[PDB]
């Protein structure tokens, strides 16, 4: 073989330096090159839950620039459970061919690239947050309101939202099969990687939480019982992928309640750090390889955790790596904006940091943390070359 | 109707810059005068726009430059500068370049494409493997086939020498570069540029270095600037009327600012002859020039430089001696937004900038940030700032 290029790493590879945040991590049959994965990022762009070439151009611009892995946004395991009109799904089979033309192009610049099931539960039909930050989508903007389901008949927010139809024991049936379809779909696409989402007030938190679930029956009522359809879905997901592909969850580690008083007397039973550190030897015990650790999501008064600080959750992620130790790897999120910070947390025992904002700010985000580090990692060769 | 505006990404919404001012040409308002100068990806394969492409392109217009000029795209094959470049010489390269023009167009910004040759300087490896060096035939090379306006290589011992260049040609040549400018119009391309720099084909009949013909192509400055003058009136032919037509030229070889290359070469391209074509190309219904510089030896190297807004003074001599007749970009590390808009407040109408776009596809942002002002970015970029 004459004239043979000379071999490259991925882009994401820390070529100097020695930083834990730019040294590969291995989960089953994937290596990501660094610890830096571009977090789950909603783009209220799709009709009917296809992938278009928005949702390309904004993944591959980001590929391009090395995360060691990238997780699309949530993607609906049902078509009710879109969070707005405007989500992926990967509820039909028409979804997969789309989505593959992504991780096609991330798998030509020898990325890994991952994707993130998911289920609105109460907050579907919602709409894009630039148009609010809880308001419905009513059928003529192709929402569902009549048809959002969850747990308990309970609103998000009284006054706001639809009230939710009350899954039945066959309705969960159903909806675990979709998900295991909904992961099978995401093989069939090609992707490195699955995430679950369980956080941010969605169907599973739904579930987690006494403040959203009231049920009396097998899947309510009990600490066993409320992480009973998380711990089935896991199962279920875990039997259709194969053994090779990592599986992420991401949750909320907590409702914030406990941390307040008045918001303690107001809501006396919710999501706690000390559940989910419980939850999280479960999970492990089901081949979930990692845990994203976000929080909030479960009311007006919990909002999803989307803050202006630096590092605004790394210390739930720290207590949860704490107690599980090696048995489970964890990633925190959430204002991890510069690469010192993003340091701080991994060499304080946190496996992997996800960024998500701050890569829509700035793509080139790996090079930004590469340059403040004083370390040098790899991008594709068209952009280091544009450099000289 | 129920349930029912933003302006496009790169629109100035707070300020008042010259540099984020709209500019209209023709039946085509850009939303500010910052673009994306042409820059070559060497990522094709047979002259096929892919992913990369589409990538690279649709994730800088997401990011609002005013204008986004897709780099050097070859009007014949044997005219690609590497066997990666883009090409327009065959009907199957219009429906990728479609999708990229497509999604543009999806966010409401403006898309043109530079139409190149490379002539005697074709055939050449990307620049990561080598500055200059043929690729041969078993990397997809051609080195038996470039064509220039005499027998005489880029670098002797580096490039192949050139197939001379007869009038037949010559004729078939300028049919090539009109039939790449009614693909590119297919293609749904709002703007078209002709490259006339870097020491590339039309450079090379520009210069007395590279074109020594005594035939009506060679000889005297209107023979030499003959065969351009006569691809902008092709071009401007079949391409729609309301169509923006660019013309990046190289300003000078340099040779006429140095006494010993002065003797060396002492006939050579200069601002002069700039001037004078500039405006002969308005004549021709050309918009706008772009001015770069070099190209066209090894002493006169492509003016890819690391100093701040090195070649603008070419663009402000050649501005001031055109006047209104034609509108003048200026190129070459505009790379602040402060020099940016300098630049155009000092006459120039708009500036591009390329690896400035690469390095920060949020180049636009940045700018007016340094410049105190607000400039759109798509809504779901500007909403990740919440
Ligand atoms: C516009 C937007 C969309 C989001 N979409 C998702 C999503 O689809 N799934 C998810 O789990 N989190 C989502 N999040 C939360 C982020 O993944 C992330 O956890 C949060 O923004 C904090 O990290 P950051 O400071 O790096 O942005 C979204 C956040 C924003 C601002
Ligand atoms: C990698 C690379 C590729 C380029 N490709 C082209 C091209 O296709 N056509 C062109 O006219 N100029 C091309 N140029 C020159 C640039 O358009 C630009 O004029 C030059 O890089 C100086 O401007 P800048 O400082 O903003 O990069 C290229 C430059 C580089 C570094
Ligand atoms: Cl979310
Ligand atoms: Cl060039």
């Not at 899947?219 to 199962?235: H, P």
Request: proline share 5%; hydrophobic share 40%.
């Amino acid at each position: 073989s004459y004239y043979t290029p000379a071999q490259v790493p991925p882009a994401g590879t820390q070529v100097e330096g020695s930083t834990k945040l730019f040294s590969p991590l291995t989960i089953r049959g994937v290596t990501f090159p660094n610890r830096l994965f571009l977090a789950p990022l909603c783009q209220y762009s799709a009709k009917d839950g296809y992938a278009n070439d928005w949702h390309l151009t904004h993944i591959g611009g980001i590929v391009q620039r090395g995360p060691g892995l990238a997780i699309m946004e949530a993607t609906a395991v049902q078509k009710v459970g879109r969070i707005t009109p405007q989500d992926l799904g990967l509820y039909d089979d028409g979804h997969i061919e789309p989505l593959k033309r992504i991780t096609e192009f991330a798998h030509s610049q020898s990325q890994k690239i991952g994707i993130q099931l998911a289920h609105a539960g109460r907050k579907a039909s919602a709409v894009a947050p630039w148009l609010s930050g809880n308001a419905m989508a009513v059928k003529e903007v192709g929402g569902w309101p009549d048809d959002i389901v969850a747990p308990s008949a309970i609103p998000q927010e009284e006054g706001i939202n639809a009230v939710p139809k009350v899954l039945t024991g066959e309705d969960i049936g159903v909806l675990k099969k979709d998900w295991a379809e909904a992961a099978k779909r995401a093989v069939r696409a090609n992707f490195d990687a699955i995430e679950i989402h369980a956080a941010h007030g969605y169907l599973l938190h739904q579930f987690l939480s006494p403040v959203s679930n009231r049920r009396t029956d097998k899947y309510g009522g009990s600490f066993e019982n409320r992480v009973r359809i998380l711990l089935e879905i896991c199962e279920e997901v875990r039997a259709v992928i194969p053994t090779a592909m990592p599986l992420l969850v991401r949750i909320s580690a907590t409702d914030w309640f406990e941390f307040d008083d008045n918001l303690t007397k107001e809501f006396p039973e919710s999501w706690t750090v000390a559940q989910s550190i419980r939850l999280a030897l479960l999970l492990a015990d089901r081949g979930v390889d990692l845990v994203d650790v976000s929080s909030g999501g479960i009311h007006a008064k919990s909002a999803i955790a989307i803050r202006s600080g630096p590092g605004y959750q790394v210390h739930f992620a720290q207590e949860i790596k704490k107690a599980v130790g090696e048995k489970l790897l964890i990633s925190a999120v959430g204002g991890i904006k510069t690469g010192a910070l993003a340091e701080e947390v991994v060499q304080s025992g946190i496996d992997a940091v996800q960024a998500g904002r701050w890569f829509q700010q700035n793509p080139g985000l790996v090079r930004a943390f590469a340059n403040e580090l004083g370390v040098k990692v790899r991008m594709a060769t068209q952009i280091d070359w544009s450099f000289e």
